[PDB]
Write a protein that binds this ligand. Sequence first.
Ligand SMILES: OC[C@H]1O[C@H](O[C@H]2[C@@H](O)[C@H](O)[C@@H](CO)O[C@@H]2O)[C@@H](O)[C@@H](O)[C@@H]1O
Ligand SMILES: OC[C@H]1C[C@H]2N[C@H]2[C@@H](O[C@H]2O[C@H](CO)[C@@H](O)[C@H](O)[C@H]2O)[C@@H]1O
Length: 347
Amino acid sequence: LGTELDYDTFCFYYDWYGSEAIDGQYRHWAHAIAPDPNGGSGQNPGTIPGTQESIASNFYPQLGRYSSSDPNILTKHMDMFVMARTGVLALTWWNEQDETEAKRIGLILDAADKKKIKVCFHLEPYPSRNVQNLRENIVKLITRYGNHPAFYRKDGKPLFFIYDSYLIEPSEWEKLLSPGGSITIRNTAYDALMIGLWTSSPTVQRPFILNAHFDGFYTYFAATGFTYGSTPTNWVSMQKWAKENGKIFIPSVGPGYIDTRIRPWNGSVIRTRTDGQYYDAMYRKAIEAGVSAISITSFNEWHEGSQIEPAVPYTSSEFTYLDYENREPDYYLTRTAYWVGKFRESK
Ligand SMILES: OC[C@H]1O[C@H](O[C@H]2[C@@H](O)[C@H](O)[C@@H](CO)O[C@@H]2O)[C@@H](O)[C@@H](O)[C@@H]1O
Ligand SMILES: OC[C@H]1C[C@H]2N[C@H]2[C@@H](O[C@H]2O[C@H](CO)[C@@H](O)[C@H](O)[C@H]2O)[C@@H]1O
């Protein structure tokens, strides 16, 4: 029918939103404003309070200030994934070691399964992250969730995205990811496809990826040109290298970028949506590069303005939000479904 989910399409999902009613605070809708890293001492940038009128986004959710722990919101999000045809939810994971995290992960897996969506983990740079505790956490996630019917596998293997993987040396990665590594996961019950973050130029990234023994790489950033890896004109040659070296390239595409509510000094990273023309151009480049899998930045990183989740016009007494302009609130979901079809036609 040209409506089914694609299980080589990964959409980055954030589960950190809270409401007073469910979580005790409108978590993440309220957010600290980041100081300017180039702006000198004594900055008191303040905070966005997460009131109805003033949230930590330049856009405003159709679903309002929702809780990521609200089963009714999770249902709606799964229906949005179905509309987008995105078969894999790539869940931010911060190793919070708290019961509220554990509950939420189970709710997300349960809701996903009702719609045949799959879940993989996006392993964030949690405190003291290193290859030993990464191994222990991969073991824990596979043990806890691996038998859940919504847990993602590709040809029998779990898949993890590793954000800011460059913070760990290749010599450490090798211990986990080479078949001969001291603490290898290869050939164990806990083997997985490990997808590292390609940031800068090939002269740095090629040996990093090879020496770390990652299975593949992704680029994350929604803003074109933010890094070498997020410059789509590089994707054909990145894919060629990937193919020559047995690596899986999963370029990241997004619909725009703007984070100036939380990072007022970061305006040079703004990428305008232009009624969908930015998203079209980026998605087309990923497909043209001939890749096997695509990642989408993001479902709902509202702080960074990269979300495809529906947004609505809103003007409050405190802020005039951006919105999808000439497009309707669900436009980026249905345009994702368009591109997933083009991707499949290519595969
Ligand atoms: O432009 C802000 C930027 O913040 C985060 O990225 C930081 C770091 O995590 C990245 O590895 C490097 C890449 O050069 O850039 C930043 O320091 C992300 O949240 C990103 O989406 C955001 O644009
Ligand atoms: O998921 C990878 C990163 C992508 C983007 N969401 C940011 C990063 O998280 C940092 O920035 C957000 C605000 O944009 C803060 O809420 C987080 O506390 C911070 O770590 C992700 O790591």
